[PDB]
Amino acid sequence: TKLLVSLKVLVIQLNPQIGQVDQTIKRTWSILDKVTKSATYVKPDIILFPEFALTGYSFHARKDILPYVTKKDEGPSFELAKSISEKFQCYTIIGYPEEDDEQKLYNSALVVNPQGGQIFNYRKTFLYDTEMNWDCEENPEGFQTFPMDFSKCAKLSNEDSYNRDVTLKASIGISMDLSPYKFMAPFNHFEFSSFCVDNNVELILCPMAWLNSTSITDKQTLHNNSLLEAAKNKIAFALKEQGLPLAGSQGIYQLKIGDSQRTPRVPSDDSTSEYKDMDEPDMSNVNYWILRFFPFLYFKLRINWFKNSSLIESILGKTRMPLDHEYYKGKHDLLDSEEVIKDTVLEKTFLGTSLGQPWKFQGKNAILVLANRCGTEDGTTIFAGSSGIYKFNGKKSSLDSLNESVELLGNLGKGLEGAILREVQFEVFR
């Protein structure tokens, strides 16, 4: 049974700096105020913030982050999300540094329902270099899905208003979750997006603190004070030339509220990575993010992969998580056994292909919401901003924004704080 859905999605893009939690909270309320005063404002069903949205990101020691960590149901990030959810009767998802009762630290995203109750807490599964600075843990559950009960958001195709309720299968992936594991696993594993396709996820939510490639990441440079000083000077000049303070822009808000301006499809070039034109998205990263969702994209070659059974061994042989992941540290050959083939094995995919279909996602819909922070930290790290909303439409082989099986519903710029609201329409089957 086809069920039509209409979701009002609001994404907030912030430039939080370490030690400015109260100021960031104030700017957040300012943004939300300006949003409600928009000419085309409509009430959001869901509001998404970036990774470590109120705290800043680049913590260099456990001691430095400890004054900002909180239990999943206490503290500034949680109280903000509860207040927002209660005032807007929506789901609110925010990234925050978490401590648990056993003094373990995580990079997390909490989810609050329209009643102001916390319904979920997701912990980052693939960690980035920065997390290793302060003793962050991997999510022992690995990637996860959860239900989100939406009220008055759905209809049958014959009906004339969205007056039905719907429970969508959602998944949160925090930044590095989208990357090959440790940057060492094969690129074409597409772990997170394969997991979402495998589990028939309909709503994908990604709080991120994702870098623009102008950032200094070369390890030899970071650990040679002469090379580092020279590299920092280059970024300094790059911001000065833009009329920006070294930390990037704060408090000047780009609002795209309820409009229908789509983001132009563009190939990555030597120029699309430049940290220039702050109100335009970083299309190098937009294209890269789209590529990491390859299993959701139409690709002609899958028909040959399926016909030749080229991926059967890959599909059968893949594990739920990487073998050395926290996941197995305590969870735990069908072609050579007498055990039967379970439904779950027939849902598994590799490169978007399953044992039963060339392209498992074909004919389906999924929504991707990416909330990425903007600004700069340490004089070395420039975040890409470019928060956006995407629809994978499942319709029938560029590996970027030119692929028409993804719809770019709208993006913010790479460099300004702000908010984007889009009505997203799609279908699910029930």
| Domain definitions of the chain by residue range | 1-430
Q: How far is CA 229 from CA 97, 105, 232, 342, in A?
A: 30, 32, 5, 57
Is 61 among the annotated ligand-binding positions?
A: no
252, with CB counted inside 10 A (0-12, 13-18, 19+), is: exposed
Q: Are 82 and 71 spatial neighbours (Cβ–Cβ below 8 Å)?
A: no
Whole-number Å distance between alpha carbons of 68 and 400? 38
Q: How many residues does the chain have?
A: 430
Whole-number Å distance between alpha carbons of 251 and 425? 31
Buried b or exposed e, range 19-47, using 16+ CB within 10 angstroms: ebbeebbebbeebbeebeeeeebeebbbb
Whole-number Å distance between alpha carbons of 152 and 429? 17
Is 209 among the annotated ligand-binding positions?
A: yes
Question: Could you tell me the sign of the dihedral formed by the alpha carbons of 430, 359, 299, 294, in that order?
Answer: positive
DSSP-assigned beta bridge partners for residue 118? 112
Whole-number Å distance between alpha carbons of 15 and 385? 9
Residue 388: partners with Cβ closer than 8 Å, 6 or more residues away: 11, 263, 281, 286, 370, 408, 409, 410, 411, 412, 420
List phi, psi (to 5°) of 367: -110, 130
Across the chain, which distance is largest between two alpha carbons, in Å?
68
Measure the CA angle with vertex 100, ends 58 and 105; round to 5°: 25
DSSP-assigned beta bridge partners for residue 255? 419
- Cβ neighbour number for residue 73 with a 10 Å cutoff: 13
DSSP-assigned beta bridge partners for residue 4? 155, 427
97, with CB counted inside 10 A (0-12, 13-18, 19+), is: buried
Q: Which two tokens stand for residue 68?
A: 């900002």
Q: Which two tokens stand for residue 109?
A: 């995203």
What kind of experiment solved this structure?
A: X-ray
Measure the CA angle with vertex 285, ends 406 and 397; round to 5°: 35
